[PDB]
Design a protein that fits this description.
The structure is cut from a larger assembly and holds chains A and B. By secondary structure, chain A is an all-alpha fold. Chain A has two helices and no strands. By secondary structure, chain B is largely without helices or strands. The relative contact order of chain B is 0.13. Classes of the chains: A mainly alpha, B little secondary structure. The interface between A and B is small, with 3 and 3 residues. Chain B: This is Major capsid protein. Chain B: Belongs to the Tevenvirinae major capsid protein family. Chain B: It comes from Enterobacteria phage T4 (Bacteriophage T4). Chain A: Belongs to the Tevenvirinae capsid vertex family. Chain A: It comes from Enterobacteria phage T4 (Bacteriophage T4).
């Protein structure tokens, strides 16, 4: 029997940075959520590959 | 649609090199056309006026 644990991340931007990203080519809201997803997905590997 | 835009220019100048210093713009609204460059002025060389 085990008790689940928590992993938390938080980045945030500024509106000015978001405004230019659409102008600069990217899609600011979608991209940022992909930024968190990749790190958290990667952060799981460091919790599994370093647990074995 | 993007910060820090641009705007170009189309200066038209005579002379062998259009970037050398002292080049005179061709279609200048103030300055007159050098109405010898296309003609007799190309054959001979008129001395420039100065003091004394």
């Amino acid at each position: 029997q085990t008790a689940v644990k928590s992993r938390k991340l938080k980045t945030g931007i500024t509106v000015e940075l978001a405004q230019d990203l659409e102008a600069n080519g990217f899609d600011a809201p979608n991209f940022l959520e992909d930024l968190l997803a990749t790190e958290m997905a990667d952060e799981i590997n460091k919790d599994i590959l370093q647990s074995l | 649609n993007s910060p820090t835009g641009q705007v170009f220019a189309l200066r038209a100048v005579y002379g062998k090199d259009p970037v050398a210093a002292g080049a005179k713009e061709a279609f200048h609204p103030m300055y007159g056309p050098d109405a010898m460059f296309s003609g007799q002025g190309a054959a001979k060389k008129f001395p420039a006026l100065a003091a004394s």
